[PDB]
């Protein structure tokens, strides 16, 4: 039989590690050629293959190529080549002799151009055949923002450049486009600073252990992130430093490897007539002496590819081996025509040709704490992403998919604490309006054992207004059933200040008049002077009314919100919580509140100093002022301690409110209690 010659360019040596690849792929192709010798498949020729050692050095490969061209017979196609440079230069030079190169290990996307390489074909899935796969995987669980991490080599940067070209048009966001060279730790720093949910790594094998070792230190793992890593490393890759397996193993879950699949996924009859299981058994029992490569499927397939191509060209040959030198190109054009439309089913599946490439099967996998178990497939010919449920696992219950999602709420107060204070609300007010009737009982049953007829009424008015203000203080703050009540904060603070100045004016003008009659020399007993004392209290009352309209004018004191941000999580869900507190002030009224508190302090320390003096002045013209100094000291300390604890709080809006309620229900009834507790006891002997 006349031979049809073909040439294989394979590493056959024992020095170069690609010699293992050539020694692994030679049994599949000799099995294919002996099966083609078994069947007819031809008329009446037989195929012959001539091996040529390359070692994928460029000079040695080109020299062996020249030797094969000069010394071999009239070859028709050319076959093989594993290292990308020695494939690329021959595929560029291929258009001279008008031949066709079929590869099975060319895994570089730079062979995608047909203006560069119009005569080149390959059956191995390239590195660009993972980018629609990762798009379908991201769209299967509805991801938008993803973070990439690429080592600065030309292949990884090329697949990063085509990543944007494949994701152009969909709901995808690219936030952290970090591209390091040898410092991945600052890359994990920048990625955690941009807190991206999904890592899209692109690096080689030796960088990966360092990446996981100094990503353990930042703790960029857990039930919050996924890791899409090219998993074409060797099995048990993690053994290759200074780190430890405790700081390596706890970051490799949710670790997704995106490879090309060697065989099919069925026990189906192929173009050989056999099944992949029987083919795999015959392959591993053909030689029994070589560690099995991951390319012998495509190696077995390509022989049937070129045999079907020449079988599809033999009828156009009959329309005319015996009429082809290396110079002819029309016959090679017919070879291109019969080769480009190749479409049949083989061991890798239904092979196609969309501009020099076949849509392969992408095998997703996951390191499930002992090994990378296969978890899912995808066929770009049909664009369907199969998955194997009840096999993938997660350290979380739900598969994390965790963007940084936030939530906010108001700061609430403790209601079993607030409710007993709301029960203490009423008693002081009813006691106030009843002791007012005891004073009108002094009016209705006249025996004036005290001061002016309006004075203890002014004390009771200050106590009632304070007990109304301290009640409607926190019912508007925390309980937000009345929502626009932070505007009513201004409508209650004037009530509180008027009650304060009324109570302390009735405390102060009386004691000042006792001082004014104590430091005299002859006599002082007038009722019109007591009228002057009451209008003297009214003068600072109207001064505080002018201060009230000055408070209206200095700021609106509208509803402001302090957003207190610490973001914890109580039950593991990534929906974080950040509380917020209502603040009534406008943060530039510090001068305003400072001058108001200084006004109150200057009006308040007068009686506190004067109580040191008048402690022995037992004046019977007013029939009072023996326990009023003991009252004014024991309220002057509590008002400043309430102001001090109030300004030293609102870090927790519960403790401040219960303590100002405590001091308010202390003072606003301890004045009435210490002004009346020997009074009615001696009037009811």
């Amino acid at each position: 039989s006349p031979p049809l010659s073909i040439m294989g360019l394979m590493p056959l040596t024992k020095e170069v590690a690609k010699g293992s690849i050539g020694r692994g792929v030679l049994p599949a192709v000799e099995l294919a050629i002996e099966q083609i010798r078994n069947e007819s498949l031809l008329r009446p020729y037989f195929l012959d293959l001539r091996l040529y050692d390359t070692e994928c050095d460029n000079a040695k490969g080109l020299k062996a190529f020249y030797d094969a061209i000069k010394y071999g017979p009239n070859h028709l196609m050319v076959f093989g080549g594993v290292c990308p440079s020695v494939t690329s230069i021959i595929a560029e030079s291929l258009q001279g002799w008008n031949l066709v190169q079929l590869s099975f290990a060319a895994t570089t996307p730079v062979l995608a151009d047909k203006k560069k390489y119009p005569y080149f074909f390959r059956t191995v899935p390239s590195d660009n055949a993972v980018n629609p796969a990762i798009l379908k995987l991201l769209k299967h669980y509805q991801w938008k923002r993803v973070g990439t991490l690429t080592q600065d080599v030309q292949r990884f940067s090329e697949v990063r450049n085509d990543l944007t070209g494949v994701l152009y048009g969909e709901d995808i966001e690219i936030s952290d486009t970090e591209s390091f060279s040898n410092d991945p730790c600052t890359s994990v720093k920048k990625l955690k600073g941009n807190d991206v949910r999904i890592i899209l790594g692109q690096f080689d094998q030796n960088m990966a252990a360092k990446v996981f070792c100094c990503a353990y230190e930042e703790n960029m793992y857990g039930s919050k992130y996924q890791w899409i890593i090219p998993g074409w490393y060797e099995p048990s890759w993690w053994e290759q430093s200074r780190c430890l397996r405790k700081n390596l193993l706890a970051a490799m879950e949710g670790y997704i490897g995106v490879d090309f699949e060697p065989l099919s996924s069925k026990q189906i009859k192929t173009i050989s007539g056999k099944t992949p299981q029987q083919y795999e058994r015959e392959y591993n029992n053909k030689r029994s002496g070589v560690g099995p490569s991951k390319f012998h499927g495509y190696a077995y397939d390509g022989i049937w590819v070129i045999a079907k191509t020449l079988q599809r060209a033999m009828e156009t040959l009959h329309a005319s081996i015996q009429d082809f030198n290396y110079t002819d190109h029309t016959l090679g054009r017919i070879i291109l025509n019969a080769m480009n439309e190749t479409n049949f089913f083989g061991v890798t599946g239904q092979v196609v040709f969309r501009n020099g490439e076949r849509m392969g099967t992408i095998k997703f996998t996951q390191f499930q704490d002992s090994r990378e178990v296969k978890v899912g497939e995808y066929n770009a010919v049909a664009d369907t992403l199969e998955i194997i449920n009840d096999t993938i696992r997660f350290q979380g219950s739900e598969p994390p998919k965790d963007k940084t999602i936030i939530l906010e709420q108001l700061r609430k107060i403790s209601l079993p604490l607030y409710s007993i204070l709301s029960a203490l609300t009423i008693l002081g007010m009813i006691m106030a309006s009843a002791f007012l009737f005891f004073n009108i009982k002094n009016r209705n049953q006249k025996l004036i054992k005290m001061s002016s007829p309006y004075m203890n009424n002014l004390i009771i008015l200050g106590g009632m207004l304070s007990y109304a203000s301290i009640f409607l203080f926190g019912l508007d703050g925390s309980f937000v059933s009345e929502k626009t009540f932070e505007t009513l904060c201004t409508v209650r603070t004037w009530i509180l200040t008027v009650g304060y100045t009324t109570a302390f004016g009735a405390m102060f003008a009386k004691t000042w008049r006792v001082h004014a009659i104590f430091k005299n020399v002859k006599m002082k007993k007038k009722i019109i002077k007591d009228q002057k004392l009451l209008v003297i209290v009214g003068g600072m009352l109207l001064i505080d009314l002018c201060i009230l309209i000055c408070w209206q004018a200095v700021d609106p004191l509208r509803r402001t919100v302090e957003k207190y941000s610490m973001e914890p999580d109580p039950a593991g869900r990534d929906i974080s919580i950040r509380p917020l507190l209502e603040h009534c002030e406008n943060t530039h009224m510090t001068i305003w509140l400072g001058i108001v508190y200084a006004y109150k302090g200057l009006l308040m320390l007068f009686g506190c100093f004067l109580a040191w003096e008048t402690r022995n002045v037992s004046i019977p013209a007013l029939n009072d002022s023996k326990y009023i100094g003991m009252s004014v000291y024991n309220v002057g300390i509590m008002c400043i301690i309430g102001a001090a604890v109030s300004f030293l709080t609102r870090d927790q809006p519960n403790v401040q409110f219960c303590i100002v309620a405590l001091v308010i229900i202390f003072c606003s009834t301890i004045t009435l209690c210490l002004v009346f507790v020997p009074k009615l006891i001696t009037l009811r002997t």
């Binding site: 460029n58 000079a59 040695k60 020299k63 020249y66 061209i69 560029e92 030079s93 001279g96 002799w97």
Partner: protein
């Protein structure tokens, strides 16, 4: 006869991305006829040339390489035209033991000897724009240089070598950006990073676009020096391109004043080489043999490199002079030819032709500058001798080279002048009057108008006000006396002294009115003579415990405030940062507020008691009206002048003026009121 035809393979791209073969082929024909015309160069042999076109296409080039290599006869030296074909042949020349000679390969990656051991090129690589660039940086000492490049291998392979060459010169490269065809965003980043000197690496068709963009952002001008390549045409900013909306003279204003670093192509002199020719006869012979025009052909500028490219290998083979029997298997002939080619050093049409250890030939770079619409030479350079020649035609903005941005720290001046001296002379008059009156009071202590009992507290107030008038001066200025930079020491000394002095004086002032109010409300003991005075003195001495507690945990600090904006100056690009100083502490604001509140507490207690005991009579009866009026003055003075020295920092006419007016008016007026009724009515 005896004419052994030695054959040499070659390659000439007639068209394609680099049409050098239109010009190099008559050049190598002239050079081969020239080495044929001399028997000194050809003792026994004769050089012949076989060649093929390649269009700078490696696909045709590999086929033609096989066609010449595996045919007959045996060739020795190869000649690739373009760059990629040169890389392809120099990668694979090692398996035949051949030596290759290029003439146009500007690839900076071709300097490696591991992948390419047997390769030389007469055309210098692109990395020899960098030593002249770093010498032009060394001439003017600039340190902050920014780089922008087109994303291309021939520029990214240049800029990293520029980095690892400039790092030995101590010049940092701050902003290293890149783009492909969008010039807007990198010049946006350069404007936002506001660098001074900018180096660019890009071709002409995007050079026009990036210069339209830099005209639009207004980043040309005074403090901007642009370094570019120089193999553009002399008309390159003038041809109409509708790809950009910038106008032609607006482009011309934008490209004004930038430095270009070309490379030589021929002898700058008019000497004669070993080839025994000059430049003009060579150009005439090229115009004779070239049927095209030199203005329209390609590779005409690199065409003089082909002549000495032939001549160097011709002199090397003549130096070897056992040569006509070369085969690819052996290596001794190859090593002999390599050794002869290693020591090549002579004078050719491109000047001195010496190879380096890697394989490149060094040359000169004619450094020029666009000076008003036309190119003009600045000077020359050679890397192997550092002979930076010059001609002094570089115009500038004002003559000087603008440099990187600097800064001047300007210290915020005080007014230590006659305004300070009026304060000091009023302080001196107060000091003399106070100490003289205190000595007169001590020297009246036998018997007087006011008797011996009362005014020893008044003597202690005189001592305290004298200490205040002694602590008023050393608050300093912006460094004006013998010895400075001990500002925390002098501030803590002045502060401690003024604190103890005011505490003593005001305490012994206030205790008298406290005790006259006490004897007014006692309804004459003075129980022990130093009882009241000693207990108010311990009330004063409580304050030195506060001073010591202020000294223990945070005594001192000399801070610097930078209250104004840099560069208010109008003509020089040196930013003026005015910085001031006030002696301070770690956290002193709340501390001084607390101390002001404490002293205000005592002062308001005094001002209320002064209105309290306004009308009384005791044994020390002739004191209370004047003591109360002095209290009424000192209280309103200290309270009206505490905030304007607390919150102010502009000390020119406000802070120190108000504070000094307060303290010296206080001590002056209180003493000149408190001693009027005593000595005038003692001798009245």
């Amino acid at each position: 006869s005896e004419r052994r035809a030695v054959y040499i393979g070659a390659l000439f791209p007639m068209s394609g991305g680099w049409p050098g073969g239109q010009a190099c082929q008559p050049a190598v024909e002239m050079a081969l006829e020239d080495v044929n015309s001399r028997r000194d160069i050809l003792p026994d042999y004769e050089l012949k040339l076989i060649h093929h076109d390649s269009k700078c296409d490696p696909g045709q080039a590999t086929k033609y390489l096989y066609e010449l290599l595996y045919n007959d006869p045996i060739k020795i030296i190869l000649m690739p035209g373009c760059s990629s074909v040169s890389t392809l042949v120099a990668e694979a020349a090692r398996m035949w033991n051949l030596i290759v000679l290029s003439y146009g390969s500007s690839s900076p990656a071709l300097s490696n000897r591991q992948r390419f051991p047997t390769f030389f090129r007469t055309h210098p690589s692109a990395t020899l724009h960098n030593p002249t660039r770093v010498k032009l940086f060394e001439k003017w000492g600039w340190k902050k240089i920014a780089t922008i490049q087109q994303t291309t291998e021939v520029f990214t392979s240049t800029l990293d070598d520029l980095e690892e060459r400039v790092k030995e010169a101590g010049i940092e490269i701050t902003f290293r950006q890149s783009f492909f065809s969008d010039p807007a965003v990198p010049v946006k980043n350069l404007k936002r990073q506001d660098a001074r000197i900018i180096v660019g690496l890009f071709y002409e068709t995007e050079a026009r676009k990036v210069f339209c963009e830099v005209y639009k952002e207004r980043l040309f001008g005074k403090k901007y020096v642009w370094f570019l390549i120089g193999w553009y045409a002399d008309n390159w900013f003038k041809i109409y391109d509708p790809s950009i909306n910038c106008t032609v003279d607006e482009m011309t204003e934008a490209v004004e004043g930038h430095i270009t670093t070309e490379i030589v192509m021929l002898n700058p002199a008019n000497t004669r080489s070993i080839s025994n020719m000059t430049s003009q006869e060579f150009v005439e012979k090229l115009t004779k043999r070239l049927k095209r025009h030199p203005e329209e052909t390609g590779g005409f500028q690199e065409a003089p490199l082909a002549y000495d490219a032939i001549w160097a290998l011709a002199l090397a083979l003549n130096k070897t002079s056992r040569l006509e029997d070369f085969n690819y298997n052996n290596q001794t002939i190859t090593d002999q030819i390599y050794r002869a080619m290693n020591s090549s050093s002579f004078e050719g049409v491109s000047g001195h032709v010496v190879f380096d250890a890697s394989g490149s030939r060094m040359a000169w770079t004619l450094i020029e500058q666009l000076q008003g619409g036309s190119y003009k030479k600045i000077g020359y350079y050679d890397s192997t001798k550092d002979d930076l020649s010059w001609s002094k035609t570089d115009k500038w903005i004002g003559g000087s080279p603008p440099a990187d941005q600097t800064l001047v720290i300007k210290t915020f001046r005080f007014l230590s002048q006659k305004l300070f001296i009026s304060v000091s002379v009023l302080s001196s008059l107060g000091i003399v009057l106070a100490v003289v009156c205190l000595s007169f009071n001590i020297y009246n202590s036998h018997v007087r108008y006011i008797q011996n009992s009362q005014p020893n507290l008044n003597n202690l107030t005189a001592v305290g006000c004298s200490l205040a008038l002694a602590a008023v001066f050393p608050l300093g200025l912006d460094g004006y006396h013998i010895g400075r930079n001990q500002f925390p020491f002098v501030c803590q000394a002045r502060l401690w002294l003024l604190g103890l002095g005011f505490s003593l004086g005001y305490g012994s002032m206030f205790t008298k009115i406290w005790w006259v109010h006490t004897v007014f409300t006692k309804k004459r003991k003075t129980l022990e003579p130093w009882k009241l005075y000693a207990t108010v003195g311990l009330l004063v001495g409580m304050d030195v415990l506060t001073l010591a507690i202020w000294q223990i945990v945070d005594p001192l600090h000399r801070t610097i405030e930078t209250f104004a904006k840099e560069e208010p100056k109008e003509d020089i690009d040196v930013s003026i940062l005015p910085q001031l100083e006030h002696c301070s502490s770690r956290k002193m604001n709340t501390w001084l507020g607390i101390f002001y509140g404490y002293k205000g507490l005592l002062l308001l207690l005094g001002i209320f008691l002064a209105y309290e005991t306004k009308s009384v009579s005791t044994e020390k009866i002739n004191d209370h009206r004047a003591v109360g009026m002095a209290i009424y003055n000192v209280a309103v003075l200290c309270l009206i002048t505490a905030p304007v020295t607390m919150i102010l920092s502009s000390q020119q006419d406000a802070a120190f003026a108000f504070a000094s007016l307060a303290i010296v008016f206080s001590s002056y007026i209180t003493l000149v009121v408190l001693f009027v009724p005593k000595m005038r009515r003692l001798i009245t």
